[PDB]
Design a binder for this molecule. Sequence first.
Ligand SMILES: O=C(O)CCC(=O)C(=O)O
Ligand SMILES: [Mn+2]
Length: 332
Amino acid sequence: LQTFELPTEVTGCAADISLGRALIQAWQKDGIFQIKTDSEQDRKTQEAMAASKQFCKEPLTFKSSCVSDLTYSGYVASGEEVTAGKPDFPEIFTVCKDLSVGDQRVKAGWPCHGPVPWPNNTYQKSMKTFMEELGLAGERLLKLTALGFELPINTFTDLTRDGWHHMRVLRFPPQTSTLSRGIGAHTDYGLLVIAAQDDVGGLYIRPPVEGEKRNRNWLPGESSAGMFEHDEPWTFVTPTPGVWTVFPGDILQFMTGGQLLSTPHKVKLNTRERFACAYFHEPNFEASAYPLFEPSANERIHAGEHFTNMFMRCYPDRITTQRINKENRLAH
Ligand SMILES: O=C(O)CCC(=O)C(=O)O
Ligand SMILES: [Mn+2]
């Protein structure tokens, strides 16, 4: 895979435009590239992964208490069945925008808005500072992408102001310990996905395949789930120190008219447990994404509406979903 070092500030100089061209080319050929982490980005990744490992060592009663009826942030034990001798399962802690009940959007009952049920304040601090760095990387990447497409440098800036960025903090069990098979082929609904992983290995991505029609996962009727899972090609994302991976999400596919494709990906379970984090760089919850290259187009996709429906469908029995239904929160 290509690995690039990003500049700290993207200003629009010739080097920035050149880098944007190269990022687009790498996505168009490989579906993914790596970005070099600096010493602080790396340190903060390691501290977040350590906090994740410590949290997963807590008893299940405690982990299961890290839930909220206002936000989807918090813990889920994935799956619905276990057996004797296969008692383990994937675990996710989702971090969405951390808004207290003092925030006006929370007071107004906006769906998905509320405070993260942090397990402790060291996990909180570790995840917040990691997500701050991930957000800055996302902004650099979007400015470079704009420059590479000959668009204004700040094309994405209003769209992502106070963006609804969120992250899944993941633990996958060893294959022999679980009835889970990992995560099947899917795409992520976001502008960009920035991901980190430990040394165990398990992530596979599907590059662009010339002539291969792709479902447009921003449309409810074109779910990408499961598609191509058993068909070649799948690229193994070899664990590599000192990098994050980056691929386009569904929103960038929409905005670019398919010049970038949302990268399908899947996770296979290994012989050891595996830790990873997947960060989703997003528009503002209230913003609508639009075609960048079709100025006459009136079609839009509303980020907040899609986020809410996706979480409601993925976690239909969570207290968060029950409260959305009880209070008819979709009406906001
Ligand atoms: O486990 C990984 O490396 C990626 C996980 C993922 O794709 C997700 O949480 O959407
Ligand atoms: Mn994913």
